[PDB]
Amino acid sequence: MVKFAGFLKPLKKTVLCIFLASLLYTALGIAGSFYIKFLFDDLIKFEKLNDLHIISAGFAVIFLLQIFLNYYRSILVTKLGMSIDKSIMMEYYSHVLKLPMNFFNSRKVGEIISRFMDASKIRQAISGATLTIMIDTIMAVIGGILLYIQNSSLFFISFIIILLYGIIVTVFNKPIQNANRQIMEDNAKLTSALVESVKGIETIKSFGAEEQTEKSTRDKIETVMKSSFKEGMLYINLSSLTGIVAGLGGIVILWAGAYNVIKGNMSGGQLLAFNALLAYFLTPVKNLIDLQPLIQTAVVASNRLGEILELATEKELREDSDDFVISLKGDIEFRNVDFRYGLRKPVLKNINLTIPKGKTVAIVGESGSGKTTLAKLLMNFYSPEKGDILINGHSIKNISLELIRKKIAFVSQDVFIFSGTVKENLCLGNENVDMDEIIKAAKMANAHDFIEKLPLKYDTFLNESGANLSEGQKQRLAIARALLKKPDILILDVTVIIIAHRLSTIVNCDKIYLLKDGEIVESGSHTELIALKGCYFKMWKQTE
Amino acid sequence: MVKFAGFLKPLKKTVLCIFLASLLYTALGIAGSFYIKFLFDDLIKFEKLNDLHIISAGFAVIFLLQIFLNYYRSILVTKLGMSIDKSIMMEYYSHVLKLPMNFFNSRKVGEIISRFMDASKIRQAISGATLTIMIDTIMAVIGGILLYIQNSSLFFISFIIILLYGIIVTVFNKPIQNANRQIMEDNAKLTSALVESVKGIETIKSFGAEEQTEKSTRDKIETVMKSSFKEGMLYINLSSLTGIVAGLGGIVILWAGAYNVIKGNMSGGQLLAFNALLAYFLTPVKNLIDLQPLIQTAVVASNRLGEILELATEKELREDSDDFVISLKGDIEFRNVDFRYGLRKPVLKNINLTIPKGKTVAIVGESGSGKTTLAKLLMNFYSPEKGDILINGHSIKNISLELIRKKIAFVSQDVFIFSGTVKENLCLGNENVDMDEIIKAAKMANAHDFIEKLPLKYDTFLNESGANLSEGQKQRLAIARALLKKPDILILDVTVIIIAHRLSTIVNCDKIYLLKDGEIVESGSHTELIALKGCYFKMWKQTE
Numbered sequence A, B: 001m002v003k004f005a006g007f008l009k010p011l012k013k014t015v016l017c018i019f020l021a022s023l024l025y026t027a028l029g030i031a032g033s034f035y036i037k038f039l040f041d042d043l044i045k046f047e048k049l050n051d052l053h054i055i056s057a058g059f060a061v062i063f064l065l066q067i068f069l070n071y072y073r074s075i076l077v078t079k080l081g082m083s084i085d086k087s088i089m090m091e092y093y094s095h096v097l098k099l100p101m102n103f104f105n106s107r108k109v110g111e112i113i114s115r116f117m118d119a120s121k122i123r124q125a126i127s128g129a130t131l132t133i134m135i136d137t138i139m140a141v142i143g144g145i146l147l148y149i150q151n152s153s154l155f156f157i158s159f160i161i162i163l164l165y166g167i168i169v170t171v172f173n174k175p176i177q178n179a180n181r182q183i184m185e186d187n188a189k190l191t192s193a194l195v196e197s198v199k200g201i202e203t204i205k206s207f208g209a210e211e212q213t214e215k216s217t218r219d220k221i222e223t224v225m226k227s228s229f230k231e232g233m234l235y236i237n238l239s240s241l242t243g244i245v246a247g248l249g250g251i252v253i254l255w256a257g258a259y260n261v262i263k264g265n266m267s268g269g270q271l272l273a274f275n276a277l278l279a280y281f282l283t284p285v286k287n288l289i290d291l292q293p294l295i296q297t298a299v300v301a302s303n304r305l306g307e308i309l310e311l312a313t314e315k316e317l318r319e320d321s322d323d324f325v326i327s328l329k330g331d332i333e334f335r336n337v338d339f340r341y342g343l344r345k346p347v348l349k350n351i352n353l354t355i356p357k358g359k360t361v362a363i364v365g366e367s368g369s370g371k372t373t374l375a376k377l378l379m380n381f382y383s384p385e386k387g388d389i390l391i392n393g394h395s396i397k398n399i400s401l402e403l404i405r406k407k408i409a410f411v412s413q414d415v416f417i418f419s420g421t422v423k424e425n426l427c428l429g430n431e432n433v434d435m436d437e438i439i440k441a442a443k444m445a446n447a448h449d450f451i452e453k454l455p456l457k458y459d460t461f462l463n464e465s466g467a468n469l470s471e472g473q474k475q476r477l478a479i480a481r482a483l484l485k486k487p488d489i490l491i492l493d494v495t496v497i498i499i500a501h502r503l504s505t506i507v508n509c510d511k512i513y514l515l516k517d518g519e520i521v522e523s524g525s526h527t528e529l530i531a532l533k534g535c536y537f538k539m540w541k542q543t544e
Ligand SMILES: Nc1ncnc2c1ncn2[C@@H]1O[C@H](COP(=O)(O)OP(=O)(O)OP(=O)(O)O)[C@@H](O)[C@H]1O
Pocket: A105, A341, A342, A344, A347, A366, A367, A368, A369, A370, A371, A372, A373, A374, B467, B468, B469, B470, B471, B472, B473
């Protein structure tokens, strides 16, 4: 669609104030643009002093009023630009935070962060000068319709100059757009490269691969600068084609004005005043054209920021919801669930689980069987394509995600810790939870002993992805967080689905499922599985 | 301090060509600034046609030559700016990749990316189109001495205008700098928060947090735009003062010139041509003052990059390398080694670890004893304290870090994968290694099977953080990579140091070290360590 900023609807009064101030400003400018005519035709050509001082003082007062009214519209336009830029950035950030998981696994962090950071633009194209120049271009249309009365042929020449400007801008419409798009794409790729290199640097500084990374970054920077030089060449071509027209048109204006003066009609002071009126007719237009890089860059930034990440399907746009579900204690009843990650290969075949309520079910299989795939399916990070997962007799499709992702706690290997207070880390999601509950969950997660050892026991900072604490001391914070988010289906009288790789820790479990070709081949407790001479028996005898 | 003469000393012919072209350009501009003097006082006041056409054509030719010179000077200036930017940017990037690990563990990924973007700002701001205007200030000095030659009465007023410009810039240099610094700091903080949120959006979705993070990002954006508004107010005050001075000075010039014409030195040329010449004395200065915010922004960004650049690398510290060490087949001899991450608390104290050659020793302890700290100290990621690490009988402090990183392989549980080809992921540091060693290291690491089952075998593409592979499948890639980097002191007849949190895998280790309270309390083989009624005994009986 079209990303037209409708945020100005609550800003109706400000726009009217700006427009009226600009109208009076241009009116005073044109009124004060007769000073040189007053000088040459009447003040000195008649040899009359003691009134030139009065005229000069009056025009100084007029210019002071012009500055006073240009100190106001600039402030108002800056406020409008702030109020638009903040709103558009917040829209984009909320939408990206509510996007599905396929988007986040099929894209690089650099692309998203660069698409956001391309918001200094748009703002720079709606700043004070950039938009007051467009308003003054309209005011220059008004000044030109005034200019038509003040001599005719010179207004025709000015119109021809405007036509030349229009042709020049039209011919250079696409190239600046494409150059900006390509430089933005290359800058996004470079930003992703730096984000990856600085994020994981233990591997680089561990394998002695600084030189290779530097060479790859040099290639990316070389591409960025080549695509920047292309834009520079197009910009210099545009600036030259505009400067030629402007200067030669001004010289033609002076030549034709002299030609008129030495041929009866019109006067020299009329020509001198016509130069300043022609300034208020052309200089806004030429200033706008010289701003075409800024407007074009902002248009490209708003197009990329809105093409995707403002049109892509959201998370909540999945299905309907329900009101009868208030608790999530039930029997999970996978029916022929098939999940394919993208398009590579079906991770899960026609799987079938019969997890009872409040059990301690364990899941085993090959290293690439898809256990974490099952855990992600149960958390609605993804969706099946032919089957129907259920809980308590009703499908989890028809349950509000704010309930599924609140009553199911899932702890994984990729423990992620946020920058902030340990209490703030623990109380993510439900911030209002009191000290007693976080203490209880920490004690139940064995993390309370560690936390009380640190100085500023719970009120201590954790830097970025946990560095103030060891990796084994962050799995326990993940456990404590999952315990705070009081669950009904716990994935590692609440149902516990433990996914583990060692066959010795999960033995005394109510039921154990084993999946090899996606589907479950064997099930039951440990004793019956051992008394089967099956795949689980082979695994147990090999790992004994 | 941050001088670009290092990247500018090679570029001298370009600078000479730019300066000479600019000199001819301003000379032709001053020559063309006599058109109106020729027009009124000689071509109009004498009523002579034809010669008017000839002079108009001549001045059109002069202006065309001016444009032809400005084209080349702009091309050369943009080439110079591009080269300077690339050079400084790569200096910063190489320095940051060579920085120690304390810096990377005490900073955020957002800050580095923001400073790199500020280097890009240095590119766009100052050295892209504005060096053609800084020269014009000196060329305006030339035009001003010519103005004094032309008429000494109005040169005093022009000098007073220049003095007012200077006072305004002097009194507005500081607040613009401070506002730019504050907006850059706040934008860096916003970038850090955003990269943390988008990078680690697993916990935000799982628990449900795309309201708290949204509120925090809204607060950060509000602070960013508050600083932006402060900068905007300072810029508007600057622009208003400059506009008042310029406009009122121009009107005073016109008034005083009319007074001179009626009361002394006269004719229209000495005013109409004087203003055209003044366009080559005051207009470049006003353009420079208008560009001053951009120059100050570039200066602040260069200051931040220089603040990063002065930080010592890893090679600058830990000097006195050695050349007589070729292999790392020796006895690790931790002697009274102490360590302390920053200033929190010593995680190690007087450790007397004495690993022999070629064994398969294991290190065990509590959940925060410091096993991975020992691995980092031996791999030489962090700086030890009183005492030193010995390998092959000599200290580790005097060994080429390249040899250490290429001869000690560390396999940590925070496995990191790079967004590239699988073969490129495997060969990190030594790209020339043939596929035979790749296959051998994969088969020895059991990672060959799943790689072979990938859709595009050993040269498949991987997303960031190995999102295209399972958590178990990613660690086997780390094992295969560390095996490719043929080690001698491999940490998980080469010495093997196994860090494990269990007690059943290490029953076959040659020796077992028990890191409990900073030091090593007990050591030996499994059987003798069980026959010690010590801390390992209670650990074994509790885990049984
Ligand atoms: N994010 C992903 N995108 C695409 N394919 C994926 C992704 N994650 C896993 N796969 C694929 O799914 C299969 C197994 O995935 P999964 O992580 O569920 O396995 P797993 O057996 O549960 O893992 P592990 O036991 O090692 O934790 C493999 O074929 C793997 O390549």
